[PDB]
Symmetry: C3
Subunit: 334 residues, 3 copies
């Protein structure tokens, strides 16, 4: 009856290599195997109207069958919506925060990358309780011009890190001839639990980002810049103190090429600097170069290596790990 | 070849609006998105015999991807059985309590309702370890006459609220010309842990209900009345004390219409009164009117609003919420 | 596009009968209902090369929908790999040890059996972080001659029971005209947390087993013999101390017949004895006879009974359970 639903997923055999047991590395050390399961469906309601829904789950494959069986298991996405011919889509539930419309540009590495797209972090990553309106080609009048607004409902959780107040954010993008340019901005109230943390001071959190990319002829090139206020979560590893960076400035870059025979090498740089952090001043949160590659056997099977050359120094005042990490992956997906 | 199984699910974007906080409301306040996933299968073994099984899970969509990720996640149903031609069906596992053959009559609202069909609550909701026998049209000899019996095995759990002793229950119903009537009753042993609770006293739990319904010509009218002894779970928020109501008296009413263009308005009333509650006597547990509507775009897509006009008063002796609660939902299902 | 993926699972209505709880039985008492869900996929990359992946999850059906909802839920398998023409298969993730290549011989009972194939126990059961290479028919040159090697990456977990160090293990088998013979062995480092336990002492865990089987003409006969040194997990029930048996010796015998009409009687014997147990000396871990049966209605539906005649005596120095257990099961699978 014009419903299309496709159960999807992957099994990801994954191993991280880092110094020691990886307490002072970028990614850690050991087994990091996991699996994904989801559905994605879409129903033709009439000529002009589609309904749709999606759910996606993370099942870790590197816990025992003992008491730790559920460590890092979670729902990543859960949302439903309606899409109306020449007017836009509207969805609600657990979904990507708008500002990920910009950060998605550089979140293209075989394993790492994407460092500033925190989950449960306002308009940066996948969160809870968002209403999202999206528009393609400006109601159909302007090919390549897209925009979105997103309404974030307050989530007063048990942890400051996973909480938020009410907020609004949005995004505008233009694509033309393989190039793409995009800007995204959100702000939200911070909750009383966030204000009580040692790190971070202010009533509102803000995040913004811009992106430029070239995505054509088997070349992928992209850059993202942005900044945040009272929005980037941080932990002092020395004091076990936590909260949010009063300011960050963040800059990511990525260069890839896709060979017809399956190989797709990747080169990147990422740097995120916190400022005005209490007791500290300026610090680096992320600072690295990346070399990697993915080999695609076909649409269902790939392998990959991903090497993070970590520029964080062993000095780092927040305890951010300074050692390198290499990831090795085998993936079956459907 | 012989076998039919169909993966099923829904994604529900869901939001509740109450004063506060929602501490003092019927339903709470904020994001309540969730998803469901299940399978349902039937195999033709021969001409007279079919095997079947069902599993159903709830994935909350309004938790973070942190330490609270698993909150409210659970298996709803997990059972397997055989259905023999003129004998009946026999199944075992986690399934609906028998007395829910009565309560289902009124559990028909867009979001709320069904207030007395508690889970893990002897016979009124989905419970563990039930062997259920069911019969259609009295061995095929009496059109519209159905019955069932169910054996509940002891579950001594860590919690009095989620426990039970051994029990037996059943249900009888007759349907004719769009009308339906149905009686159900179960009784069981209480566990020591339940007897140790300050609220509620008795060796035995009991629950019964009767149902009346009209279900034709696009009209749905239904009413349930019931009582319980030592069965309905309760809390006194003034004392942080818990247990079970020595007695309750329960009445639910529902009226709905289905318009061919998809709109289905709903009107309801629910009162549940506890009696003989230690240090209190009588006290309402539930008391409200409902108005709502579901808009069905088709078999896969729907939206709804449900408004609960809460008649509980701010003097209620157990601290039961007195504020209403409006729910708004968007549903993709397959 | 040359991909075949099956979603699969089962619903198992399951009940165990034992004296009392029974806190002193082989298997326990009460509702043991569960379900499984998994996918299994295979993609033809080219005429000589296949990709594959598998995920499998256990969903308990005997928990309430309260705080205990998650007890016993776990990923059993999560792996992906490549299979090349005659050269062999390579996979990584959570998978069966390499010593279960032998123990699978007798792990054939309707419900029980398989006592020495502990999960998260080096090479005997399902684990986390294994790299497994497998070869059939010695590169296509010797019909019926198969072998495998497996590399076990260290998992330092919160618990001694679920930890391992790095190890290697392997297996070799040979089948000809319904007869089968197998040998398997592995060794790995113990972790410091393991060595810190009062029970067990040694740098290295080791496990080995051999198997003979006849599997033809509806007869199934199999035997396994095995030993372990610092690998088999134990608890002293009197003193509440835990660790690993310094040694064990294990025998598991099985006989079954498959009638064409669906019945499949089973008879078994299992004994595992620990030696050099701190504070104790020699003591039986498992000692029983089995007598059960499985009735297959078809490929999707079965029932079974499994009766374990426990020869553990009430004298057991470790407090191992001595009473019998009977299981009754109903299974829908797809
Ligand atoms: C169908 C769900 C209703 C979505 C509204 C959620 C409210 C979030 O916005 C908060 C205001 O800023
Ligand atoms: C008590 C039942 C045990 C039956 C064992 C027979 C196995 C025969 O060896 C396999 C060839
Ligand atoms: C020793 C048993 C001989 C059975 C002869 C085959 C005819 C089929 O009858 C069995 C059908 O009923 C199935 C009931 O199984 C549940 C145990
Ligand atoms: Br995926
Ligand atoms: Br994160
Ligand atoms: Br559903
Ligand atoms: Br029920
Ligand atoms: Br309703
Ligand atoms: Br409930
Ligand atoms: Br299965
Ligand atoms: Br191909
Ligand atoms: Br185990
Ligand atoms: Mg773990
Ligand atoms: Mg502060
Ligand atoms: Mg600030
Ligand atoms: Mg460095
Ligand atoms: Mg009492
Ligand atoms: Mg009121
Ligand atoms: Mg020791
Ligand atoms: Mg005995």
């Amino acid at each position: 009856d014009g419903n299309k639903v496709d159960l999807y997923g992957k099994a990801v055999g994954l191993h991280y290599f880092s110094k020691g047991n990886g307490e002072n590395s970028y990614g850690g050390n050991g087994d990091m195997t996991y699996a994904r399961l989801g559905f994605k469906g879409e129903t033709q309601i009439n000529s002009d109207l589609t309904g749709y829904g999606q759910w996606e789950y993370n099942f870790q494959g590197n816990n025992s069958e003992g008491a730790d069986a559920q460590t890092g298991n979670k729902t990543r996405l859960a949302f439903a919506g309606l899409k109306y011919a020449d007017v836009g889509s509207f969805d609600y539930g657990r979904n990507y925060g708008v500002v990920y419309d910009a950060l998605g540009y550089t979140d293209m590495l075989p394993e790492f990358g994407g460092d500033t797209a925190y989950s449960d972090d306002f308009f940066v990553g996948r969160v809870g309780g968002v209403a999202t309106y999206r528009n393609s080609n400006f109601f159909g009048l302007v090919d390549g011009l897209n925009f979105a607004v997103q309404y974030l409902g307050k989530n007063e959780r048990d942890t400051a890190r996973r909480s938020n107040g009410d907020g609004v954010g949005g995004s505008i993008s233009y694509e033309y001839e393989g190039f793409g340019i995009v800007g995204a901005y959100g702000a939200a109230d911070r909750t009383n639990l966030q204000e009580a943390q040692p790190l971070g001071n202010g009533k509102k959190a803000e995040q913004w980002a811009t992106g430029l990319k070239y995505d054509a002829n088997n070349i992928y090139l992209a850059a993202n810049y942005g900044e945040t206020r009272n929005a980037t979560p941080i932990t002092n590893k020395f004091t076990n103190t936590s909260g949010f960076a009063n300011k960050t400035q963040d800059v990511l870059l990525v260069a890839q090429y896709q060979f017809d025979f399956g190989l797709r090498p990747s080169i990147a740089y990422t740097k995120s600097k916190a400022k005005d952090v209490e007791g500290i001043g300026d610090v680096d949160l992320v600072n690295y170069f990346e070399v990697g590659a993915t080999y695609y056997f076909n649409k269902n099977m790939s392998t990959y290596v991903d090497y993070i050359i970590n520029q964080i120094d062993s000095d780092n005042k927040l305890g951010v790990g300074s050692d390198d990490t290499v990831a090795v992956g085998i993936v079956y997906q459907f």
